[PDB]
Write a protein that binds this ligand. Structure first.
Ligand SMILES: Cc1nc2cccc3c2nc1N[C@H](C)/C=C\C[C@H]1CNC(=O)c2cc-3[nH]c21
Length: 273
């Protein structure tokens, strides 16, 4: 079933998420990504409308799937005795934001604005679809280098969006909010805004602002690179200690630093080509 449909290429990466290979769909030569995840390594299980027991990740990807290119598209999935295999769309050429920032260092603010805006549109879409990502970070963002379009990947730490408190977390600790560190409690949207503040800092400074738990709890932001006052203000707002002091997504996108965003194509032409 999987063998007669897909042609497996080289390993793209492996980690907590599992193992992801490059691939081609034989029928139409479509570039794909083949993700393998061990059953033992999945703690978060979900159910389809069919009543079928699948990883939460599959549930969440189906819930976010549409013509919108800001989230990775799940094309197909398969169950093996000891693993689940996910077929994902693969943009070509592509590079993850972590690698991109590593190569460029700190991003120009115009470029950071375009990237951050697109991330915001992607996250808002997820929330509007009842999906919380819980792992927003540079490594989980792909850049379509031709089109200047960004894509959220890896919903393996995600959950159904709810208005009540989360007492579980499996994403990246250095992106997690002080209320998680201190109390093991957080709410979806406000935790997501914190991680977005970490991400934005990372874009404009070339690195994350905090490494240790004590740094997260203190939440004192030091800028190691030249960053405009407007951007600094937005970052500090997203990184407010009290979750209710953090901006809503609307407030972020209405912020003066976020005005006059480039289109993705304009972004690629100026910054990527
Ligand atoms: C180059 C590349 N293309 C991709 C296309 C579709 C989906 C993924 C993807 N990943 C890469 N490269 C990255 C660096 C490799 C592993 C990261 C891994 C992280 N978790 C995922 O679910 C996922 C999806 C893709 N990649 C991942």
């Amino acid at each position: 079933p999987l063998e007669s449909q897909y042609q497996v290429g080289p390993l793209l990466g492996s980690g907590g998420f599992g193992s992801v290979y490059s691939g081609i769909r034989v029928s139409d030569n479509l570039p794909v990504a083949i993700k393998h995840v061990e059953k033992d390594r999945i703690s978060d299980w979900g159910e389809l409308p069919n009543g079928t027991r699948v990883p939460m990740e599959v549930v969440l990807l189906k819930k976010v799937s549409s013509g919108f290119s800001g989230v990775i598209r799940l094309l197909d999935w398969f169950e093996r005795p000891d693993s689940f295999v996910l077929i994902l769309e693969r943009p070509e050429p592509v590079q993850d934001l972590f690698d991109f920032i590593t190569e460029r260092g700190a991003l120009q603010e115009e470029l950071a604005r375009s990237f951050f805006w697109q991330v915001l549109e992607a996250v808002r879409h997820c929330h509007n679809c009842g999906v919380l990502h819980r792992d927003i970070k540079d490594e989980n963002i792909l850049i379509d280098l031709n089109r200047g379009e960004l894509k959220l990947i890896d919903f393996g730490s995600g959950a159904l969006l709810k208005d009540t408190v989360y007492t579980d977390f499996d994403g990246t600790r250095v992106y997690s909010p002080p209320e998680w560190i201190r109390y093991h409690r957080y709410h979806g949207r406000s935790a997501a805004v914190w991680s977005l503040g970490i991400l934005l800092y990372d874009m404009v400074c070339g690195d994350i602002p905090f490494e240790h738990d004590e740094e997260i709890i203190r939440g004192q932001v030091f800028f190691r690179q030249r960053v405009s006052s407007e951007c600094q203000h937005l970052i500090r707002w997203c990184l407010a200690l009290r979750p209710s002091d953090r901006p809503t997504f609307e407030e972020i996108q209405n912020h003066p630093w976020m005005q006059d965003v480039l289109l993705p194509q304009e972004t690629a032409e100026i910054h990527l080509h």
